[PDB]
Paper text:
This occurs via the oxidation of ubiquinol and the reduction of ubiquinone in a process called the Q cycle.
For the two inhibitor-bound structures, there is clear inhibitor density at the Qi site which does not appear at the Qo site, supporting that these are selective Qi site inhibitors. However, gross changes in the side-chain position can be detected; for example, His201 shifts in position between the two maps. For SCR0911, His201 is well defined and is in a position consistent with hydrogen-bond formation with the inhibitor, whereas the density for GSK932121 suggests that there is no hydrogen-bond inter­action with His201 and the density is more poorly defined. In both structures the ligand can form hydrogen bonds to His201 and Ser35 on the neighbouring helix. The Qi site amino acids adopt similar positions in both structures, with an average Cα r.m.s.d. value of 1.46 Å; there is a clear overlap of the α-helices.
Residue numbers in the entry:
A (entry chain F): 12 to 109
B (entry chain O): 22 to 227, 235 to 439
C (entry chain R): 1 to 32
D (entry chain N): 2 to 445
The structure:
């Protein structure tokens, strides 16, 4: 079943093994930075640590124990609510020109 | 046509006057000025004057800005210590657009925090610009002295609250004062039941000026002294207040002629008899629902203001004693009858007079009746008016080089 | 003051087509 | 009850003329107030270098006594009636007017005769106002905006009267006489060149009975060559760069030659300017504005302010823009400003033109709100155009606009022309005129 397949792919990717969430990985982009800038300080300052920890792991070419890995059901989509807003704003700017 | 007028059971007001003008004009007045701010959420209303043209539940900040400009309309905000005002202009073939934008700003704004934070330093601009005009220092520092809490609040955010105003305070301030009971929707070149349709559809929703007196002295580097001296007044609507309004013009509340010598201004002449050095002076008359203020505003040099203020103080003093004649008073009436009618001449200045009454009264006062109230004023009331200025406790404020400036008690 | 400021004569250098203050320069701009 | 139907119900304007050549007009409305005044075809353009400032000097003494209302007696009657009184002057036109009530018309007209007719020009007052006006110039030395345009006209319109200021040099202010003024007044103030006009709660017919009563006495004639005529004036392409680093901001003004009043393409240009619009640092739109100039300026903080003007003279004018900016931000502005001009000369869309048209509609309507600006529109239009144009006809002229019109007209008057430039303050970054001129075209 597809849900089980989504789950396996998640563990196969391995950014749970570095304690990261999904939205921590998205390609730095204009629509994204706008969304990041709008984050609150609590959620943002957590994003920075999830990253800076992970980089400190890949430098050492190590990972965390299974107890700290990110769980699929716990994969928080903290950035999409703000990002889907921004992309909506962009299409209005384009549609308004047309 | 005649000005329609009514009220809703939820306490909301509507008017309408289809003037057949090409351009409509709509204005949503309200009793949510700066007096409704406590010491904690100061600067709130200054942010709201700028918080228009931000995101809403009904539309985004981009749609509002361009959608207005695409039809060439306009959006403007005016505030007082009591009232606020959201106003538009457009062509009467474009009314329904501007309303949908107008109400989404008023009714249901979101005030998303990042837009707010990008807007905060704009306060430092709009403030410091308007404080180039030195009066704004004086008047603001004046109300801080005469009054304690409510009307002493500044329209302009103080420097320490910059970047500290939250959206939380706003939505609270919205819900706490943006109520249907306090509003008054007005439209010109527009039919009455339209605004009824809009208001019923959308707008159908849910401190004292204690006088104290005192003095402020803002020593600055400037050759000219700006100064004022006032006393407690009567609130608007009182026939008592009309007496001040007459007394305002008897003294001379600014020139009617370009570069004229203010021949009839008793103050400017009384000062001229003593002083022979460039000066200016005029009657100050502020009125409010709870209270008001009256006195005169001063402009002089650093080494001559102490003579100017005393001369003005004495000219008012003699008039309080009884030195006043009917034709002098009759002249000020002709001035006052003119000042009112000339103010409401435009659609805009009219629009401010309509809803101000509508919030402060259950019905519009026609201007002809206002003229009758002017004629009702007696000369003795104008004298007793001046007695209050002299006898009542004072409030003072200045700014400039105060090396030679007196105090209240020396006057 | 600033109103006392006035331009001097460039007519020694100006083109002959534009030495008449009373005429509109546009007519020969195409040629200039 | 549409926009067009409101234009239909606009009050038609009345006109007339006296036997002595004087023109009369009015507009009736249901107002209780009314504005009435005089508008003259006189200004500094008609002045020589030796009477430069006279027409401004008269603006003071006209309200300082007459043969029948000497001294401040005049002022006492105005304030007695509660009316206002006001004046202004231009390089072409001068006007006195009263703002008063509907009933107080026959006294308003009564004074405007005694003001124009019987200005005593007391020698004592001539020397007082002489000192005052020298004090005004020192104040206007600080009004940096007024300086630039005065520098601007000096350079665009070299060797002509239009280079002069309304106020003229301080020298002539010091070196003036009563005789110089009586010459100026006895020459220019003639009924044919003048206009009475009004608006508000009055009637045309009421105005005539007073005009004949008072204004029948004007000199409706003149000698064989007493009244001058205006020739065209020589625009030229030039620059003036008044360097003053001590001052914190930098005013700039660039422009070109204009059509004139009566030229019909003025309409299209008012749109083109309106597309660019105008900006201050107090406007809350910011980036989301429509004018891509205003959008960029609010984003990058390239400036504090700018605008778009079209000054129209008898057969020419200035067309361009004014702007304020920090000394480290000029070069960015003149690269975007010229870009938008050349953008329009090459490619403009109906949407933004339509956006501009809707602005021009509202401005004319919104400008005509009150008895005062209406009778202004009457007065000068009767001097500039000879008649008045109703908003129905303006709309009709607007209707013939589209993108094609704008591309052409701007290409006539922006593309590859020789502009006038002015600067005042730390203008070190200002591109030299060959770079300004280099950007007045594209390689596209």
């Amino acid at each position: 079943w597809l849900e089980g397949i989504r789950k396996w792919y998640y563990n196969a990717a391995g950014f749970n093994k570095l304690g990261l969430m999904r939205d921590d990985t998205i390609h730095e982009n204009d629509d994204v930075k706008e969304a990041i800038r709008r984050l609150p300080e609590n959620l943002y300052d957590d994003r920075v640590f999830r990253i800076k920890r992970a980089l400190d792991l890949s430098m050492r070419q190590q990972i965390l124990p299974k107890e700290q890995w990110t769980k699929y059901e716990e994969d928080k989509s903290y950035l999409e609510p703000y990002l889907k807003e921004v992309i909506r704003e962009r299409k209005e700017r384009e549609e308004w020109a047309k | 046509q005649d000005l329609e007028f009514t009220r809703l059971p939820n306490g909301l007001v509507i008017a309408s006057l289809e003037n057949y003008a090409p351009a409509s004009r709509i204005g949503l007045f309200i009793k949510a000025g700066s007096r409704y701010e406590n010491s904690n959420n100061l600067g709130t209303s200054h942010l709201l004057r700028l918080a228009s043209s931000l995101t809403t539940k009904g539309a985004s900040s981009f749609k509002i800005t361009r959608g207005i400009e695409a039809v060439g309309g306009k959006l403007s905000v005016t505030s007082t210590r009591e009232n606020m005002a959201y106003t538009v202009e457009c062509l009467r073939d474009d009314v329904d657009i501007l309303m949908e934008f107008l109400l989404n700003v008023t009714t249901a704004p979101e005030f998303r925090r990042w837009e707010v934070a990008a807007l905060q330093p704009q306060l430092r601009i709009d403030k410091a610009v308007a404080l180039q005009n030195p009066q704004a220092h004086v008047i603001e520092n004046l109300h801080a002295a005469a009054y304690r809490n409510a009307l002493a609040n500044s329209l302009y955010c103080p420097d320490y609250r910059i970047g500290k105003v939250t959206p939380v305070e706003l939505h609270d301030y919205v819900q706490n004062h943006f109520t249907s009971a306090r509003m008054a929707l007005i439209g010109l070149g527009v039919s009455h039941p339209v605004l009824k349709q809009v208001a019923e559809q959308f707008l159908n929703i849910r401190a004292k000026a204690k006088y104290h007196g005192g003095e402020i002295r803002e020593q600055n580097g400037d050759s000219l002294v700006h100064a004022a001296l006032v006393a407690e007044s009567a609130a608007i609507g009182s026939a008592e207040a009309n007496a001040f309004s007459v007394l305002q013009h008897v003294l001379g509340a600014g020139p009617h002629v370009k570069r004229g010598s203010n021949a009839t201004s008793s103050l400017y002449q009384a000062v001229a008899k003593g002083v022979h050095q460039p000066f200016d002076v005029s009657a100050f008359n502020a009125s409010y629902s709870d209270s008001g203020l009256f006195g005169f505003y001063t402009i002089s040099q650093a080494a001559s203001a102490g003579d100017v203020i005393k001369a003005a103080y004495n000219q008012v003093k003699t008039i309080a004693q009884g030195n006043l004649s009917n034709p002098d008073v009759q002249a000020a009436k002709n001035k006052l009858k003119a000042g009112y009618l000339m103010s409401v001449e435009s659609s805009e200045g009219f629009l401010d007079e309509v809803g101000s009454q509508a919030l402060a009264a259950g019905s519009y006062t026609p201007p002809s009746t206002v003229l009758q109230q002017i004629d009702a004023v007696a000369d003795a009331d104008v004298i007793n008016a001046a007695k209050k200025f002299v006898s009542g406790r004072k409030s003072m404020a200045a700014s400039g080089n105060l090396g030679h400036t007196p105090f209240i008690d020396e006057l | 003051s600033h109103t006392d400021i006035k331009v001097p004569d460039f007519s020694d250098y100006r083109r002959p087509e534009v030495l008449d203050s009373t005429k509109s320069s546009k007519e020969s701009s195409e040629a200039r | 009850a549409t926009y067009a139907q409101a234009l239909q119900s606009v009050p038609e304007t009345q006109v007339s003329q006296l036997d002595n050549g004087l023109r009369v007009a009015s507009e009736q409305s249901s107002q209780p107030t009314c504005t009435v005044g005089v508008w003259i075809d006189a200004g500094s353009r008609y002045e020589s270098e030796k009477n430069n400032g006279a027409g401004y000097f008269v603006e003071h003494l006209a309200f300082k006594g007459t043969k029948n209302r000497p001294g401040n007696a005049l002022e006492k009657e105005v304030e007695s009636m509660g009316a206002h009184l006001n004046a202004y002057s231009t390089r072409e036109h001068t006007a006195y007017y009263i703002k008063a009530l509907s009933k107080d018309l026959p006294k308003a007209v009564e004074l405007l005769a005694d003001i124009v007719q019987n200005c005593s020009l007391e020698d004592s007052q001539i020397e007082k106002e002489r000192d005052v006006i020298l004090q005004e110039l020192q104040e206007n030395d600080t009004s940096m905006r007024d300086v630039v345009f005065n520098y601007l006209h000096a350079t665009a319109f070299q060797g002509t009267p239009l280079a002069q200021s309304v106020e003229g040099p301080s020298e002539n202010v010091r070196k003036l006489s009563r005789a110089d003024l009586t010459e100026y007044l006895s020459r220019h103030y003639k009924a044919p060149r003048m206009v009475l006009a009004a608006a508000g709660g009055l009637e045309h017919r009421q105005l005539l009975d007073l005009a004949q009563k008072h204004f029948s006495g004007l000199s409706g004639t003149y000698d064989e060559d007493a009244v001058p005529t205006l020739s065209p004036c020589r625009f030229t392409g030039s620059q003036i760069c008044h360097r003053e680093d001590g001052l914190p901001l930098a005013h700039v003004a660039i422009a070109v030659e204009g059509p004139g009043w009566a030229h019909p393409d003025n309409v299209a240009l008012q749109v083109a300017n309106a597309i660019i619009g105008h900006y201050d640092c107090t406007y809350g739109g910011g980036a989301h504005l429509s004018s891509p100039l205003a959008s960029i300026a609010a984003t990058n903080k390239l400036c504090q302010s700018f605008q778009t003007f079209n000054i129209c003279y008898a057969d020419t004018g200035l067309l361009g823009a004014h702007f304020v900016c920090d000394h480290m931000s000029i070069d960015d502005m003149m690269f975007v400003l010229q870009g938008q001009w050349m953008r329009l000369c090459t490619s403009a869309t109906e949407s933004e033109v339509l956006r501009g048209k809707n602005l021009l509609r509202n401005a004319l309507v919104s400008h005509l709100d009150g008895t005062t600006p209406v009778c202004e529109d009457i007065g000068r239009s009767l001097l500039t155009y000879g008649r008045r144009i109703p908003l129905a006809e303006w709309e009709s002229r607007i209707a013939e606009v589209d993108a094609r019109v704008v591309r052409e007209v701007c290409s006539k008057y922006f593309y590859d022309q020789c502009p006038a430039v002015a600067g005042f303050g730390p203008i070190e970054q200002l591109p030299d005129y060959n770079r300004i001129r280099s950007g007045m075209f594209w390689l596209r």
